[PDB]
Write a protein that binds this ligand. Structure first.
Ligand SMILES: Cc1ncc(COP(=O)(O)O)c(CN)c1O
Ligand SMILES: Cc1ncc(COP(=O)(O)O)c(CN)c1O
Ligand SMILES: [Br-]
Ligand SMILES: [Br-]
Ligand SMILES: [Br-]
Ligand SMILES: [Br-]
Ligand SMILES: [Br-]
Lengths: 418, 418
């Protein structure tokens, strides 16, 4: 065989392939997909069909490059109101293949051979490999919970401020923030936003805000975007996804917005990476935004209704998890839940990648033995910090009510309904 | 005023993210670009509507990273019969965001700092910035016509074999061939394939074969896959594109196929660049392939009929270009035609003190003055060899007959039929 692509990371340790194979083999109740197991808003789906059947022959041929005009116009209209700034749809917006390619273009376009990039743990999968492929030097800080009080919220997962400030120096090029957080569901409050913002200003660093779950914060809390804080617009790039916005994860269309000066770099990467994105999908998404745009302050707006929809599911999962004996972290946003398992550790029941990490062991055991699949949070930590995720497990509650209930009956039957 | 030494220098905007703005500004007869003017096969468009409207909720959520299982299976079935070998759909094929991202994954995945990459001029423009971004060192050889003086064939555009072998040394990592060739339309015969194949076998270099136009070769020529030469399968990566195979450039789905050992590198680049490609589009393309797989030898097969559809249009354009004074190169394949325009070629009636490669100026002045697009072939040459393309223009003849007559009319009037 060959070897290394050319001094790469070869992240074949992509948890997803491993767990997809496991689910295929054991067919469990799958709480590990990362997407809804039912249908997305009908208007969006019909929009794609209408684009496919469009009478315009150009509806399915190459579109602009930096973004389908109908789409970038709609995105500028939405985010212009959200950040109270007129965003230039042609120079301050870039459509990319999902938020994923947006991340890639921003790190590939702004991180060079020895640049430091601080990453908050647990991190979304691609953050470290992308940094490393850009030649950058990742610098990790974990979010860690406060275990006292009883109940636990994603708000209780916090950073050490002294550690955080010590991580920043003149070599810091970039910091990647994820709000709402995957998978904790943590929503950064203004104070937390201010801590990062002041650091970025003090050391002149680019702030990359992964805000894919921006519309899913649960009522008590509020999503606040760092690009709105004093002095941050000029040093922030924020990212979103149509997949997350409209629950159409297989559509793989996302975007970055920010000052043209910063977006320029993403453009040079994008243009010689994929050059342009699917035209019928971008048209369908544009009509989806136009639709919501007309009812943005209405409770039936999908941007407003998603949270109510998921909140019931979140409280249900939190409840049955606590039931079985786990301690769930209640998320402030998103559709993932992390819970601390204190069931039979690496005892008679565990014996797998024993060498490896216990959360892998547990999650594969429950799939095989109980028929319930979750994901191991250890996968989202740097090797030296992996032990912080070993007591936990990630579940997704964006699921049909009957499947959530099946999961509850399996845990009850496993536990012993009292 | 920082620097991005990742070699993402210059290239402020590719030719596409320039001329695509000129057309979408002066809205002329768009013969530049590279797409059909009219509807693509209905069975394909129908298949996309069907995927958006599928009762299966997974049809519009995340599919396998390396490619939708249905597409990969169909891709393997097709290419297995053409390459005369069973290709593994799971490890020897990778689905990508057009041939563009396939090319990107291949270069990023196989060329490290200092690797030499041989590119043949004129070349599809992304080859050079891709190898630059990977830290590679491009080496160029131009194709030149055989003492031509008017209407000739793309067959007489040839490279100097002694110049070619001279380029091969122990630093040579890869060579990129494009057949059918953009923008000449050149189809490499067996002898020309054997020449680069022997050099690849002697110098242990990777051959990358861009064959997105594989189904548009005109009689009496035929497309030959270099991966079928004696010992080439182990050292060749072959690329195709659904946008070109099914005339749906807007779908942006391509693929790479070859030995598992070479494909792993690609997988790793893709995984950490975009992770996955649109699911409903991949499904629609899979259904397209399954449709054609049943009538491979029928004249109704789009793989067979497209060249007969294009041939008449090719003949028409060669005639009206020659009637207006140009000396066109009749392509053996594809839907592009380059022609030598002679307004200043031997007449001092024109002179541009400006000094900026004439084909850019001639071609821009047409869309703005006569409402006829076209693109400057100097954009497909390395900086020192650009002058080679200055007396040429590339046109696309994949258009409705009525628009083709429109071009010939604005050309006759422009010159003066009388
Ligand atoms: C934090 C985060 N960032 C980025 C992405 C990527 O989004 P996309 O699927 O649009 O590429 C995800 C996807 N689930 C995500 O959770
Ligand atoms: C030679 C060549 N290679 C690759 C591509 C890109 O293909 P795709 O649009 O499928 O990314 C083109 C596109 N016009 C091309 O001409
Ligand atoms: Br609806
Ligand atoms: Br809520
Ligand atoms: Br909110
Ligand atoms: Br023909
Ligand atoms: Br071989």
């Amino acid at each position: 065989k060959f070897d290394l692509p050319k001094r790469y990371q070869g992240s074949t340790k992509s948890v997803w392939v491993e767990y997809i194979q496991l689910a295929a083999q054991y067919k469990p109740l799958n709480l590990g997909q990362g997407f809804p197991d039912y249908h997305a808003p009908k208007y969006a789906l019909n929009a794609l069909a209408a684009a496919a059947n469009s009478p315009d022959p150009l509806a399915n041929q190459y579109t602009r490059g930096f973004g389908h005009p109908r789409l970038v116009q709609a995105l500028s209209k939405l985010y212009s109101q959200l950040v109270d700034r007129t965003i230039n749809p042609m120079t301050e917006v870039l459509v990319t293949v999902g938020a994923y390619e947006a991340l890639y273009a921003t790190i590939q376009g702004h991180v060079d051979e020895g640049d430091e990039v601080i990453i908050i743990e647990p991190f979304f999968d691609c953050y470290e490999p992308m940094v490393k492929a850009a030649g950058g030097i990742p610098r990790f800080i974990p979010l860690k919970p406060n275990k006292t009080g009883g109940t636990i919220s994603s708000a209780d997962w916090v950073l050490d401020n002294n550690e955080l400030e010590a991580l920043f120096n003149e070599k810091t090029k970039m910091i990647i923030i994820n709000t709402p957080h995957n998978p904790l569901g943590k929503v950064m409050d203004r104070a937390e936003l201010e801590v990062v913002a002041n650091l970025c200003k003090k050391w002149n660093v680019l702030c990359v805000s992964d805000e894919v779950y921006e519309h899913m914060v649960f009522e008590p809390f509020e999503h606040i975007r760092i690009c709105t804080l004093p002095g941050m617009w000029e040093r922030t790039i924020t990212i979103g996804s149509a997949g997350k916005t409209f629950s159409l994860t297989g559509w793989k269309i996302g975007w970055a917005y920010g000052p043209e000066a910063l977006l320029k770099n993403l453009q040079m990467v994008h243009q010689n990476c994929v050059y342009t994105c699917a035209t019928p999908i971008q048209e369908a998404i544009a009509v989806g935004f136009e639709t919501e745009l007309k009812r943005l302050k209405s409770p039936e707006c999908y941007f407003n209704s998603i949270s109510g929809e998921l909140m019931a599911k979140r409280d249900y999962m939190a409840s049955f998890l606590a039931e079985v004996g786990m301690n769930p972290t209640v998320p402030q946003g998103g559709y993932f839940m992390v819970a601390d398992w204190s069931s039979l550790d690496s005892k008679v029941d565990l014996t797998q990648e024993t060498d490896a990490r216990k959360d892998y062991r547990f999650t594969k055991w429950m799939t095989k033995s109980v028929g319930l699949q979750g994901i191991p949070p250890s996968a989202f930590y740097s090797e030296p910090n992996k032990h912080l995720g070993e007591d936990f497990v990630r579940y997704c509650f964006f699921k049909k009510d009957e499947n959530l209930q099946k999961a509850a009956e399996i845990l009850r039957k496993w536990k012993g309904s009292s």
